[PDB]
Amino acid sequence: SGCNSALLDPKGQIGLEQRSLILTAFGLMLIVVIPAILMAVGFAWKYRASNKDAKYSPNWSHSNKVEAVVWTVPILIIIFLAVLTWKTTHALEPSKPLAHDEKPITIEVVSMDWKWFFIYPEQGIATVNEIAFPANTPVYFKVTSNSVMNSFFIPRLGSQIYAMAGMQTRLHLIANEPGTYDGISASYSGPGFSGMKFKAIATPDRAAFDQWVAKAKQSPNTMSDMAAFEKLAAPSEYNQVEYFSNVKPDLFADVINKFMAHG
Template identity: 60%
Template structure:
């Protein structure tokens, strides 16, 4: 027994050493969604411990209690039933399953990534495109874009519209919460909010080829003034993200440095989704862009919509009312 405890002690030290370099970002949330998800992790851990700890304890105690040399242990070779044991092994799991069912039902609805966050502050819309092997962030309200760098103000919801121009990826900012997939020809949605300023690591958590390990980005949560400065810095870039510029950017590349685009062709996100849908059109993405432009100043109401069919682009100025019709 002494040898067993000694081995467990050394194993514990080894695990501590291995984990010493880990940054458990999921357990240090900086936003509302991340905080709720941390609570769920701790609750699930506690419920598992209710079962796991007694089982581990009994695994050690039973061999010791019923060892051959212990003459005081009850010898019952014909034992087959115990009402007390039956009550324990059925009642406790049933209670745990019931608790998990309630938690799963309520949290699945409360933390639905498609559900907008309640806030008095105006949300920031960011359109996200995953590529080989980099992230493109488009700010349609401001007409700018960035690669591998995302910025937003604290205490304001961020409404993400997410797609892929390549294989399936997964968009994840651990300290803000909620991973969601980016898929070609589809638009997924995610709503997050940061409560503390800082630089948070973002990544893809779905293997997507050679450059996957370097497919990271920085999520910068800043003050309102800091966000305005970041937008101004992006606008100062001379680079334009039009059809030709996007084609160049979409070329597979690894360890792509942060870059900015001071001018972005309106409707770019919808065109990226549509080009993977064949003859089908992505009305949801188009309507989302139209609604956003409807909320923007009057001078930016006219949009240049791009529909890709066979790689060709067609442009047309469409008003929000016409688009909804």
């Protein structure tokens, strides 16, 4: 339709591609679904019992041309939609990096009990429930969980990806337009799932993004080690944006190694 919703009006290249395939699939299915509903109401009304001047062949129960057509048209619509499914599933794979001359910004995403934790490794900072990145720049999300399965989702920008503990998913996104986009967990995770909800800020340029990084380095609190991590990973709800200025250089690997611990 013509909504200003997050999916019918997306602001990222991945979301625009998904909107295009949603509209294409929707129209291809309308080709076969709209005559079905129209013949449902029309065949209901037209061949009434009270309607004397109809044909009424009660013993006609098989044909070859009707049977051939009603097999044929679903076959052809499913062939076209299947070809488009093949091409678009290989094109919009979340683990596949985006074709872009800008080098991506790597953001590390950890689903805490009911909050979103973010690590910028090459910037060496951390945030809760807020990310920023320059617009028109590819963004590489390395996503894992800390407790249970979640689903990292910025609907205006692109796809979901599951956040699972002890294992690393990866997503590639980009924003085609500066702004502030609501992100959520899209997989229920317990009493607090309604609160785990963040903002992604697409700054208009790199200088505004560097200013947001420089604001994060002024934070008194540091994520220096695992003790600060488990202090922050204590369960809580609806937590505000906070920043961390010093980050242990491989914290993401440490969080995943908590669950791949051998001995």
